Design a protein around this motif. Structure first.
Motif, PDB file in Angstrom:
ATOM      1  N   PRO A  33       0.815  -1.219   0.000  1.00 19.17           N
ATOM      2  CA  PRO A  33       0.000   0.000   0.000  1.00 19.17           C
ATOM      3  C   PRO A  33       0.844   1.263   0.000  1.00 19.17           C
ATOM      4  O   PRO A  33       2.075   1.198  -0.040  1.00 19.17           O
ATOM      5  CB  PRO A  33      -0.820  -0.129   1.290  1.00 19.17           C
ATOM      6  N   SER A  34       0.182   2.418   0.081  1.00 16.06           N
ATOM      7  CA  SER A  34       0.859   3.687  -0.160  1.00 16.06           C
ATOM      8  C   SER A  34       1.783   4.063   0.992  1.00 16.06           C
ATOM      9  O   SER A  34       2.935   4.445   0.769  1.00 16.06           O
ATOM     10  CB  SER A  34      -0.164   4.792  -0.394  1.00 16.06           C
ATOM     11  N   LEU A  35       1.287   3.984   2.226  1.00 15.67           N
ATOM     12  CA  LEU A  35       2.016   4.381   3.432  1.00 15.67           C
ATOM     13  C   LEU A  35       2.240   5.879   3.533  1.00 15.67           C
ATOM     14  O   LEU A  35       3.209   6.312   4.159  1.00 15.67           O
ATOM     15  CB  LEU A  35       3.368   3.671   3.560  1.00 15.67           C
ATOM     16  N   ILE A  36       1.373   6.693   2.944  1.00 15.02           N
ATOM     17  CA  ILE A  36       1.503   8.137   3.081  1.00 15.02           C
ATOM     18  C   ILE A  36       0.615   8.671   4.194  1.00 15.02           C
ATOM     19  O   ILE A  36       1.088   9.350   5.109  1.00 15.02           O
ATOM     20  CB  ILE A  36       1.219   8.828   1.732  1.00 15.02           C
ATOM     21  N   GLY A  37      -0.679   8.362   4.157  1.00 13.80           N
ATOM     22  CA  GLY A  37      -1.563   8.832   5.207  1.00 13.80           C
ATOM     23  C   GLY A  37      -1.304   8.206   6.560  1.00 13.80           C
ATOM     24  O   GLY A  37      -1.701   8.775   7.579  1.00 13.80           O
ATOM     25  N   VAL A  38      -0.653   7.041   6.590  1.00 12.54           N
ATOM     26  CA  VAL A  38      -0.337   6.400   7.857  1.00 12.54           C
ATOM     27  C   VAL A  38       0.695   7.230   8.612  1.00 12.54           C
ATOM     28  O   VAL A  38       1.361   8.112   8.058  1.00 12.54           O
ATOM     29  CB  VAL A  38       0.159   4.963   7.633  1.00 12.54           C
ATOM     30  N   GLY A  39       0.827   6.944   9.902  1.00 16.44           N
ATOM     31  CA  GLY A  39       1.717   7.730  10.728  1.00 16.44           C
ATOM     32  C   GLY A  39       2.740   6.921  11.490  1.00 16.44           C
ATOM     33  O   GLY A  39       3.158   5.848  11.050  1.00 16.44           O
ATOM     34  N   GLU A  40       3.152   7.440  12.644  1.00 15.11           N
ATOM     35  CA  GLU A  40       4.112   6.742  13.486  1.00 15.11           C
ATOM     36  C   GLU A  40       3.486   5.549  14.197  1.00 15.11           C
ATOM     37  O   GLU A  40       4.174   4.552  14.446  1.00 15.11           O
ATOM     38  CB  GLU A  40       4.700   7.713  14.507  1.00 15.11           C
ATOM     39  N   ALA A  41       2.195   5.626  14.523  1.00 22.46           N
ATOM     40  CA  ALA A  41       1.546   4.537  15.244  1.00 22.46           C
ATOM     41  C   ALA A  41       1.466   3.278  14.393  1.00 22.46           C
ATOM     42  O   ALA A  41       1.691   2.168  14.893  1.00 22.46           O
ATOM     43  CB  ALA A  41       0.153   4.967  15.694  1.00 22.46           C
ATOM     44  N   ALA A  42       1.151   3.428  13.107  1.00 22.28           N
ATOM     45  CA  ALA A  42       1.080   2.270  12.225  1.00 22.28           C
ATOM     46  C   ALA A  42       2.433   1.586  12.116  1.00 22.28           C
ATOM     47  O   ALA A  42       2.534   0.360  12.234  1.00 22.28           O
ATOM     48  CB  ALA A  42       0.578   2.692  10.846  1.00 22.28           C
ATOM     49  N   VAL A  43       3.492   2.367  11.897  1.00 19.70           N
ATOM     50  CA  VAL A  43       4.830   1.795  11.786  1.00 19.70           C
ATOM     51  C   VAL A  43       5.227   1.118  13.088  1.00 19.70           C
ATOM     52  O   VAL A  43       5.788   0.015  13.083  1.00 19.70           O
ATOM     53  CB  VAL A  43       5.843   2.878  11.379  1.00 19.70           C
ATOM     54  N   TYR A  44       4.933   1.754  14.222  1.00 21.77           N
ATOM     55  CA  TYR A  44       5.281   1.159  15.507  1.00 21.77           C
ATOM     56  C   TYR A  44       4.598  -0.187  15.692  1.00 21.77           C
ATOM     57  O   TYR A  44       5.246  -1.181  16.031  1.00 21.77           O
ATOM     58  CB  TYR A  44       4.913   2.096  16.653  1.00 21.77           C
ATOM     59  N   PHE A  45       3.282  -0.238  15.475  1.00 21.49           N
ATOM     60  CA  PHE A  45       2.565  -1.492  15.677  1.00 21.49           C
ATOM     61  C   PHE A  45       3.026  -2.560  14.698  1.00 21.49           C
ATOM     62  O   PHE A  45       3.134  -3.736  15.058  1.00 21.49           O
ATOM     63  CB  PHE A  45       1.060  -1.281  15.544  1.00 21.49           C
ATOM     64  N   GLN A  46       3.304  -2.175  13.455  1.00 19.33           N
ATOM     65  CA  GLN A  46       3.618  -3.174  12.444  1.00 19.33           C
ATOM     66  C   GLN A  46       5.031  -3.719  12.614  1.00 19.33           C
ATOM     67  O   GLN A  46       5.287  -4.887  12.306  1.00 19.33           O
ATOM     68  CB  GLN A  46       3.422  -2.575  11.054  1.00 19.33           C
ATOM     69  N   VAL A  47       5.962  -2.902  13.108  1.00 18.28           N
ATOM     70  CA  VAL A  47       7.346  -3.353  13.205  1.00 18.28           C
ATOM     71  C   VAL A  47       7.635  -3.964  14.570  1.00 18.28           C
ATOM     72  O   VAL A  47       8.324  -4.984  14.667  1.00 18.28           O
ATOM     73  CB  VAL A  47       8.305  -2.196  12.891  1.00 18.28           C
ATOM     74  N   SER A  48       7.128  -3.355  15.644  1.00 11.55           N
ATOM     75  CA  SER A  48       7.447  -3.840  16.982  1.00 11.55           C
ATOM     76  C   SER A  48       6.882  -5.235  17.216  1.00 11.55           C
ATOM     77  O   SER A  48       7.503  -6.056  17.898  1.00 11.55           O
ATOM     78  CB  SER A  48       6.917  -2.866  18.031  1.00 11.55           C
ATOM     79  N   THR A  49       5.708  -5.521  16.659  1.00  9.05           N
ATOM     80  CA  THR A  49       5.150  -6.863  16.744  1.00  9.05           C
ATOM     81  C   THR A  49       5.800  -7.834  15.771  1.00  9.05           C
ATOM     82  O   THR A  49       5.613  -9.045  15.915  1.00  9.05           O
ATOM     83  CB  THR A  49       3.642  -6.832  16.499  1.00  9.05           C
ATOM     84  N   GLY A  50       6.556  -7.342  14.794  1.00 11.06           N
ATOM     85  CA  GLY A  50       7.283  -8.195  13.887  1.00 11.06           C
ATOM     86  C   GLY A  50       6.574  -8.522  12.593  1.00 11.06           C
ATOM     87  O   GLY A  50       7.172  -9.172  11.732  1.00 11.06           O
ATOM     88  N   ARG A  51       5.321  -8.092  12.427  1.00 14.49           N
ATOM     89  CA  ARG A  51       4.603  -8.375  11.189  1.00 14.49           C
ATOM     90  C   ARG A  51       5.285  -7.747   9.986  1.00 14.49           C
ATOM     91  O   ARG A  51       5.057  -8.177   8.850  1.00 14.49           O
ATOM     92  CB  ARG A  51       3.162  -7.879  11.294  1.00 14.49           C
ATOM     93  N   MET A  52       6.110  -6.732  10.207  1.00 16.23           N
ATOM     94  CA  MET A  52       6.862  -6.064   9.155  1.00 16.23           C
ATOM     95  C   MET A  52       8.179  -6.762   8.875  1.00 16.23           C
ATOM     96  O   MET A  52       8.418  -7.854   9.403  1.00 16.23           O
ATOM     97  CB  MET A  52       7.031  -4.586   9.441  1.00 16.23           C
ATOM     98  N   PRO A  53       9.080  -6.157   8.118  1.00 12.27           N
ATOM     99  CA  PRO A  53       9.293  -6.610   6.741  1.00 12.27           C
ATOM    100  C   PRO A  53       8.881  -8.045   6.523  1.00 12.27           C
ATOM    101  O   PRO A  53       9.361  -8.978   7.170  1.00 12.27           O
ATOM    102  CB  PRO A  53      10.803  -6.432   6.545  1.00 12.27           C
TER     103      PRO A  53
END
Ligand SMILES: CCCCCCCCCCCCCCCCCC(=O)OC[C@H](COP(=O)([O-])OCC(O)COP(=O)([O-])OC[C@@H](COC(=O)CCCCCCCCCCCCCCCCC)OC(=O)CCCCCCCCCCCCCCCCC)OC(=O)CCCCCCCCCCCCCCCCC
Ligand SMILES: CC(C)=CCC/C(C)=C/CC/C(C)=C\CC/C(C)=C/CC/C(C)=C/CC/C(C)=C/CC/C(C)=C/CC/C(C)=C/CC/C(C)=C/CC1=C(C)C(=O)c2ccccc2C1=O
Ligand SMILES: CC(C)=CCC/C(C)=C/CC/C(C)=C\CC/C(C)=C/CC/C(C)=C/CC/C(C)=C/CC/C(C)=C/CC/C(C)=C/CC/C(C)=C/CC1=C(C)C(=O)c2ccccc2C1=O
Ligand SMILES: CC(C)=CCC/C(C)=C/CC/C(C)=C\CC/C(C)=C/CC/C(C)=C/CC/C(C)=C/CC/C(C)=C/CC/C(C)=C/CC/C(C)=C/CC1=C(C)C(=O)c2ccccc2C1=O
Ligand SMILES: CC(C)=CCC/C(C)=C/CC/C(C)=C\CC/C(C)=C/CC/C(C)=C/CC/C(C)=C/CC/C(C)=C/CC/C(C)=C/CC/C(C)=C/CC1=C(C)C(=O)c2ccccc2C1=O
Ligand SMILES: CC(C)=CCC/C(C)=C\CC/C(C)=C\CC/C(C)=C/CC/C(C)=C/CC/C(C)=C\CC/C(C)=C/CC/C(C)=C\CC/C(C)=C/CC1=C(C)C(=O)c2ccccc2C1=O
Ligand SMILES: CCCCCCCCCCCCCCCC(=O)O[C@H](COC(=O)CCCCCCC[C@@H](C)CCCCCCCCC)COP(=O)(O)O[C@H]1[C@H](O)[C@H](O)[C@H](O)[C@@H](O)[C@@H]1O
Ligand SMILES: CCCCCCCCCCCCCCCC(=O)O[C@H](COC(=O)CCCCCCC[C@@H](C)CCCCCCCCC)COP(=O)(O)O[C@H]1[C@H](O)[C@H](O)[C@H](O)[C@@H](O)[C@@H]1O
Ligand code: HEC
Ligand code: HEC
Ligand code: HEM
Lengths: 223, 55, 110, 107, 53
Positions: A32-52
């Motif tokens: 997806p675009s990842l423009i309208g998202v903020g710091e909270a989305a990145v925090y939740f997605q990376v800290s839980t490990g669902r990211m990269p």
């Protein structure tokens, strides 16, 4: 040194651009675009490990995180600098907050959980199955900020609860109820998993009936 | 519970007056019942089984 | 038999109404919630009578064992052929008992 | 025959007698919903539950109180019901909250 | 509003009797559910009633 997101846009360029684009533009194949998202989305997605994420399918599962040593902040600030999404809560030290968001009220929190949250997860926060693959995970190992950012950002196929339909007290009370429901004893013996009568029927058939039939074999003769 | 109690009474009465069946074996016929008498043994085994199930 | 005994014990504390009340009890995560009178009576059995949770758990486990034992007994009767000429009516009575036990357990846990 | 009819005659009820007052007379229970208007042009808000009982168990809503990926349950309000202070309004509200055809999903 | 009201000494003649209950003005009239519960518990107490002669 807040004027430093050169780190941030050093890790994104070497771990994300293959699926989101160099300008956070949403490669029309995968991400997806990842423009309208903020710091909270990145925090939740990376800290839980669902990211990269690897191949990517019906649900990206929770895994081990790759980034810390304050680089989750780096990617979060870099992404926040390209939009206006929600931000992560902070304590008077600058770190990410905790036990002060425990809605001192568990009755209201539990009623809100049963009305809004228990449909997909459970009575007490165990898992639940959705359609065609996807499921709703267990709420036991998630900490407080992860719960807040989860119901604030609305991850894949989970609805998005804004701060206007679910105020901040409501969120704090829901967090408190979840953290209490996952850490309370079972005052009746060993609970069989948190679910209803299926583990109970299995335990009956595989403990009580075998004990009864074994004693019947011992007492009575066979012919 | 009342209907179940009446039906259980009738069930056990029918089993008591039509004597029990048995498996074919050494001394077993269609005209006799081979086993143990109630008097010392069968009541004892039944009561012990009751206590074990309650346990 | 165990079901009979534990149910007679349980009837001394249960109130089967559907009127609404506010809890105001000892279980804190439910204080202030509006509930029926039957649910409150069950909570009071669970948390405010010395040995009540134990008794209702025995009741439920005994119901489960009742059903399972009935089914195993039916399997025996069917496979060994003990339903032939002199005993068809006893088979019929057993079937009625099975149906009644099913519906009784249902009405009980509801 | 007479005895059995008298024994089983107190339980039988007619499901289609008009008992619910609406804007076109009176209907059967199984066709009214609580979203049904009562005096031809009354306003029924989409109230939401708050989980608390100081004054509001139900509050009105605005279209901006929701984002593009949200869902919410709503109930019929009828401002003539008021908040849950008196016993009369408390009864009205507790009967709104327990109606098997009242809840609605807002997408 | 009132299921219970205060009394004055002149509201009675020399041959009258009346039943009375403890009031405790912090109970208020029976409007809200809280005051209604307080009042319904005052009305049902086996040692509350009193005869005024
Ligand atoms: C209800 C809830 C109850 C809970 C369930 C538990 C009860 C289930 C019964 C299990 C065991 C039954 C025991 C038994 O039958 O013994 C009877 C037994 C009769 O023995 P019998 O002479 O061989 O039988 C009569 C004919 O000979 C029989 O000769 P036959 O071979 O020709 O058989 C013909 C039979 C053929 O008919 C049948 O087979 C159908 C029977 C179903 C009847 C319905 O017809 C009958 O005789 C039926 C007899 C009915 C009596 C017992 C039924 C009671 C239970 C009914 C429950 C509700 C229905 O009576 C006893 O004397 C027992 C001894 C105890 C007495 C001690 C007294 C001490 C002093 C008292 C102090 C005072 C204080
Ligand atoms: C059945 C389906 C297919 C599940 C099988 C898993 C699948 C992914 C691969 C199976 C491999 C198979 C095709 C080849 C042969 C394998 C060989 C024959 C042995 C495997 C057989 C399996 C493991 C037996 C169990 C299968 C399953 C259907 C049994 C259900 C049992 C129920 C659900 C128990 C419920 C239950 C639950 C859910 C609890 O959480 C719990 C927690 C704490 C205490 C108790 C319980 C409890 O009893
Ligand atoms: C034998 C009999 C059923 C024949 C009847 C004749 C037939 C023609 C009449 C018509 C019946 C109709 C047409 C179809 C019947 C199908 C169904 C709709 C019937 C409804 C009720 C029915 C009659 C009850 C009978 C079921 C049957 C007799 C169960 C007996 C099973 C056996 C004999 C137990 C032996 C020992 C046992 C295996 C110990 C090991 C434990 C194993 C794992 C038990 C398996 C097991 C079971 C059985 C569970 O029920 C269960 C429920 C919830 C969670 C888990 C389990 C579970 O693991
Ligand atoms: C209270 C709360 C905490 C729990 C309450 C739950 C409730 C179910 C309590 C159950 C108490 C219950 C009565 C336990 C049974 C005790 C047993 C039967 C003791 C006797 C066992 C054994 C050591 C003695 C031998 C028994 C024989 C000799 C006499 C007794 C006897 C019995 C007991 C039979 O049931 C029986 C049935 C059919 C034929 C004959 C007999 C028979 O002879
Ligand atoms: C609801 C409604 C409006 C009223 C609610 C209450 C109401 C239903 C009360 C119950 C009514 C009901 C019980 C009516 C019963 C009337 C019966 C007894 C009619 C039979 C009378 C008839 C003329 C006599 C012939 C029957 C005889 C010859 C055989 C039957 C018979 C009977 C009936 C015995 O009671 C009896 C007792 C002890 C030993 C043997 C027998 C016996 O052989
Ligand atoms: C006389 C007195 C009661 C008057 C009271 C006076 C009055 C003034 C006082 C008022 C007080 C009132 C309010 C209460 C008093 C009583 C009250 C406290 C009771 C409420 C509940 C209470 C706690 C119950 C206590 C009793 C309990 C401890 C004892 C239970 C033990 C019993 C019931 C076991 C019996 C088993 C069963 C019913 C017998 C069936 C016959 C036997 C088992 C044979 C069965 C059997 C058969 C028949 C086969 O054919 C067979 C064939 C092949 C293989 C096996 C079998 C087989 O096992
Ligand atoms: C199976 C369905 C067959 C039903 C046949 C009856 C048809 C006609 C029908 O059922 O309509 C009632 C009339 O009832 C009756 O006599 C039915 C008696 C027939 C017994 C059937 C025996 C088998 C009157 O309406 P309703 O006002 O709702 O009932 C009130 C009144 O019974 C009464 O005040 C009282 O019983 C109330 O409980 C009430 O609900
Ligand atoms: C002749 C009897 C034999 C027929 C078999 C019985 C079948 C049950 C007959 C039955 O109950 O069907 C209702 C009919 O009611 C009635 O008063 C009919 C009279 C009651 C007959 C049964 C009573 C037995 C006593 C007399 C003994 C349909 O009307 P309703 O229940 O109101 O639902 C909607 C509204 O009519 C709505 O206005 C319309 O727009 C429709 O959408 C629909 O009809
Ligand atoms: C192409 C593989 C891939 C990689 C590599 C990847 N992502 Fe994702 N990302 C996805 C997909 C696919 C989604 C869609 C969300 C979903 O369906 O679970 C997503 C979703 C997101 C979201 C949430 C989007 C939203 O609208 O809420 C964020 C934030 C995000 N990615 C950031 C990152 C970060 C940070 C990294 C680590 C540098 C990263 N991505 C690396 C594929 C990838
Ligand atoms: C069935 C719709 C649905 C609803 C309604 C829902 N969830 Fe979720 N939830 C999900 C799904 C699907 C995920 C997985 C998202 C992912 O893995 O990216 C999830 C993930 C989560 C997680 C992350 C769990 C973990 O271990 O990382 C938390 C925490 C959470 N939800 C909390 C809540 C709360 C609180 C509510 C009530 C306000 C709620 N959810 C309502 C479906 C739902
Ligand atoms: C005969 C077969 C019976 C079955 C299969 C059965 C089954 C059940 C079950 C499973 C429950 C749920 C209990 C719980 O979850 O806490 C229950 C509740 C109850 N049973 Fe039974 N029961 C039986 C007989 C009886 C009898 C004979 C009585 C009384 C004389 C009785 C009295 C009760 C009461 C009062 C409750 C509600 C109390 C509570 O839920 O805590 N039962 N029944």
């Amino acid at each position: 040194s807040s004027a430093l997101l050169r780190t941030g846009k050093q890790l994104f360029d070497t771990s994300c651009v293959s699926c989101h684009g160099a300008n956070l533009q949403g490669v029309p194949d995968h991400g997806p675009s990842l423009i309208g998202v903020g710091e909270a989305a990145v925090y939740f997605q990376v800290s839980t490990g669902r990211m990269p994420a690897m191949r990517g399918e019906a649900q990206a599962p929770r895994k081990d995180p790759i980034f810390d040593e304050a680089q989750i902040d780096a990617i979060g600030a870099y992404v926040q600098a390209n939009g206006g999404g929600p931000t992560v809560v902070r304590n008077p030290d600058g770190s990410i907050a905790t036990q002060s968001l425990r809605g001192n009220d568990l009755g209201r929190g539990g009623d809100l959980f049963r009305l809004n949250c228990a449909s997909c997860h459970n009575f007490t926060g165990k898992g639940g199955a959705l359609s065609s693959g996807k499921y709703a995970p267990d709420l036991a190992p998630a900490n407080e900020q992860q719960i807040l950012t989860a119901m604030l950002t609305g991850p894949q196929n989970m609805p998005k609860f804004s701060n206007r339909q679910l105020s901040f007290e409501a969120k704090k009370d829901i967090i408190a109820y979840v953290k209490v429901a996952t850490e309370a004893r079972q005052p009746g013996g060993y609970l069989l998993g948190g679910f209803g009568p299926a583990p109970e029927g299995m335990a009956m058939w595989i403990i009580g009936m075998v004990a009864a039939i074994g004693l019947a074999l011992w007492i009575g003769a066979r012919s | 519970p009342g209907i179940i109690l009446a039906l259980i009474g009738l069930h056990l009465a029918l089993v008591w007056f039509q004597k029990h069946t048995q498996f074919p074996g050494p001394g077993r016929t269609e005209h006799n019942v081979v086993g143990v008498r109630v008097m010392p043994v069968f009541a004892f085994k039944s009561g012990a089984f009751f206590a074990a199930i309650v346990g | 038999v165990v079901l009979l005994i534990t149910g007679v014990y349980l009837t001394l504390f249960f109130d089967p109404s559907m009127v609404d009340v506010t809890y105001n009890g000892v279980y804190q995560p439910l204080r202030g919630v509006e509930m029926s009178r039957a649910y409150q009576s069950a909570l009071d059995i669970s948390f405010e009578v010395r040995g009540g949770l134990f008794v209702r758990q025995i009741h439920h486990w005994a119901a489960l064992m009742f059903a399972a034992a009935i089914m195993v007994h039916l399997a025996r009767i069917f496979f060994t052929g003990a339903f032939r000429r002199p005993r068809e009516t006893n088979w019929v009575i057993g079937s009625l008992l099975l149906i009644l036990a099913m519906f009784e357990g249902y009405f009980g846990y509801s | 025959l007479g005895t059995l009819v008298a024994f089983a005659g107190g339980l039988i009820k007619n499901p289609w007698k008009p008992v619910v007052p609406t804007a076109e007379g009176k209907k059967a229970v199984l066709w009214t919903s609580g979203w049904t208007p009562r005096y031809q042009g009354e306003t029924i808000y989409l109230a939401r539950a708050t989980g608390t009982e100081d004054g509001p168990p139900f509050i009105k809503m605005r279209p901006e109180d929701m984002d593009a990926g949200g869902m919410e349950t709503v109930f019929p309000w009828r401002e003539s019901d008021g908040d849950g202070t008196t016993v009369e309004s408390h009864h009205k509200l507790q009967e709104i909250a327990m109606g098997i055809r009242n809840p609605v999903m807002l997408i």
